[PDB]
Symmetry: C8
């Protein structure tokens, strides 16, 4: 819809399942772990935050180059 | 602009012979195992119906 | 108008004339036949659906590379 | 974004010497034989009037 | 503002001064003369129509490659 | 999208030493002789004020 | 379109060990010394919170 | 949000601190000084105008190539 001023493309992801892996993100094609909730809430201001099951992360990694 | 860095769609059939949920994500076809992941990606990409008999043709059109 | 999230460019086409060829589509420059109405209704969620006479398909093919 | 993958326009003249309906579609000029096809493409590209005497100049400007 | 579906970039131009040169246009970087008013009204549906004095056409040509 | 195929701006000064109206059109600087042309291009590109003393610096920033 | 010619974001932490205000501007990471500059760039780019412990990972994702 | 017709990307900058450097601008990646207020008000019609402390200009220069 509207232009992306941030120079950041990607999303935060986590699971609400029984085996959490914390919060992680794809940022410009680079997967990282997020250690602090402050950082999660900061990036929630500029990129989407979605749910991904632990069993599906491997497949998402291959699609995100 | 597309802030998510994701282009593609989820697809499945409601016919009698399900192939589960799959997706094209940035030109890469993957299977999706869990409904949590389906609903997560439904927040950022479209989700459409494709019959099992038509998947082969859609595969050739994509990538 | 609005951005294309689907990564799909093209259209469905069919004729309402006397000699139907079923439903077909151009998807990212690739022409395919569509076998099932479920697939037609699915792609109608993301790409246009237009009418093309059987006599005009040959000319449209050459324009769509 | 243009989801249809089609860029161009239909053109015809309402003058006394018709040349039918034609179109530039993705830089390729074609003739259109049937009104069903004209109305189909009118859903996704503009349709304008061009006199027969001006088609040669428009051809040179396109492609 | 909104996307250009026509595959045409340019403008019609004419002068209302004392020495008219008729209607002309830049279409995709190519300057052409327009012979018939039907064509002027057709292209007015998809590209702007502006006034350019005869004395200024030479300078506009050099800017339009 | 910009349908006009023109990117740039008109510029002039209202100071005591006018340099007339000029424009950058697609990275090419030109002089404009007639007010009809100024008002024509004001329909499709912005028109701003630039002092004579600042034109040299704007020229270096453009093209 | 982005008229400012600036893509990026300001970042800081509200934790106990501040690293001040920093920014990624067109893929270049810089420190910002003065609040006037922070408020100036807040007019044109987003400003987000990043914990000190996460800056290393964000650096690797950027540039 | 909306398209940039001007062919100009950048911003004006100045400080309201104790040691002013006047008005300056980045125009298409080129830093210039602005001598006259007429020019400042003209470019304020097409590009943003922001505050930058004198102490921070050096860092902004390196980010703006």
């Amino acid at each position: 819809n509207v232009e992306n001023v941030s120079g950041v493309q990607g999303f935060l992801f986590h699971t609400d399942g029984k085996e959490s892996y914390g919060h992680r993100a794809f940022i410009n094609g680079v997967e990282i772990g997020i250690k602090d909730i402050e950082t999660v809430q900061g990036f929630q201001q500029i990129i989407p935050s979605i749910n991904i099951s632990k069993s599906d992360v491997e497949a998402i990694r291959k699609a995100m180059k």
